[PDB]
Design a protein around this ligand. Sequence first.
Ligand SMILES: [Ca+2]
Lengths: 75, 378, 55
Amino acid sequence: VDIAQSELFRGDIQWRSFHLEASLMDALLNDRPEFVRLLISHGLSLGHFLTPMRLAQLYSAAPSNSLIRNLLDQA
Amino acid sequence: EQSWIPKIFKKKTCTTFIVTLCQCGRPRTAHPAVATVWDSDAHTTEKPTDAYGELDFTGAGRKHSNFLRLSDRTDPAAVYSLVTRTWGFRAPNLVVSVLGGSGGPVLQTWLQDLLRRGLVRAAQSTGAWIVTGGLHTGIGRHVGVAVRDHQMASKVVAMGVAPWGVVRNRDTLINPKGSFPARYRWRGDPEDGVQFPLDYNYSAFFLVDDGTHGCLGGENRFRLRLESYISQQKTGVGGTGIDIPVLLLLIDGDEKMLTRIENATQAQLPCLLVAGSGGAADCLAETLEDTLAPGSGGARQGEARDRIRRFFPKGDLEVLQAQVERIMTRKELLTVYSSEDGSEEFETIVLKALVKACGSSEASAYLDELRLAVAWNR
Amino acid sequence: SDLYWKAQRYRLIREFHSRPALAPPFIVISHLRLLKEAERKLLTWESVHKENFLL
Ligand SMILES: [Ca+2]
């Protein structure tokens, strides 16, 4: 994350909320804690970001035959 | 108990007509029968003020908000005497005048945290004053929610100056005999971009009347005049007290604010600018970072910043560059607050700014800054 | 064990909190008789302390 913050988030590049929505999903799906903290910290509106389709996508990322995955399958 | 208020204060009306629509925003049909280039003072009529009183916001609130409408051409001395004596407001140990536009309904989370944690706690600790725009928009709203969040987590005297005309529900404030009971429809359903509601977190309201139906920048003259008079005032008890430091906090802004800071610096008032605020405020911070940069390769850097740190309109114009040059002519007064990845601590910055602004060997001039150093724990 | 006793102390108090006020020999008559802004302010106060603790 230090490389990304030092290079991409040095302030020279003008970012946008939609420019980070895809990356935010990737960090959440790939278990990147420092990145989601960094991405949200850079003025990202979480309330408008989260959608029921996105939430369903997040729960669909249960790792293989995990215990949680079994509960959704039963549910 | 407010008999002198209509007498020692005045209100401004449009009077003449200077075009269907004139410059005052009040159209031809609704106009006095007394009806080139409009003049705020030559084309206005002075009448006794008829909007003073104590506002009581509907619902949650302190049931006390002293709001007064006063003409622009008024001495700040009378206003300060009214606030300190009649309204019972204690003489402030510090006055912070938050300035800026802060374009956008929302601001950065770190910026909001610095406002709520840094400014409000520092104001609360020393019993300071926070003078902002008395409107529920821009920086005025942001400081309003910061005060409200701190208050409910525990007061802080934060008042607002707003032009007369841009205030919604101005019909319920009119009572020449006094508006001590007053109900405000701050939650009015209709929304418009020329009239904004008053925040419910401000202890006092100063409605600047200049004979217009509503615009921006009509309170700048009174705002600077009030700040300078307080800076040249003692903390009560007559002359036995010490001076009251006055500091200006700047976040973002536009061309109108750039004149404000230049005028304030001309008025010998310490200024404080925060890095990363946005356009028209980081330009000064970057120019401070260059400091005594050489003219060769740096003279055009001003115009480069004019186009990248500010909007394209007036960027090619060198009038703003002249304003920049005038500002650095007294660069000792103003200082920059480094974000430091969200320091949320600027009492040291304020103390450093105030101590460097005085520049007097006499210990009397440094008494006020000493008390603030005592009031805070640094 | 000291932690366990402290934890189970709440269970004892809750059990006796809802018990009828009379003694078991006389408990029959008791059995026969048997048959906003403040919340938001509190949460903000808690949240402020959380950020202070984290900082
Ligand atoms: Ca001083």
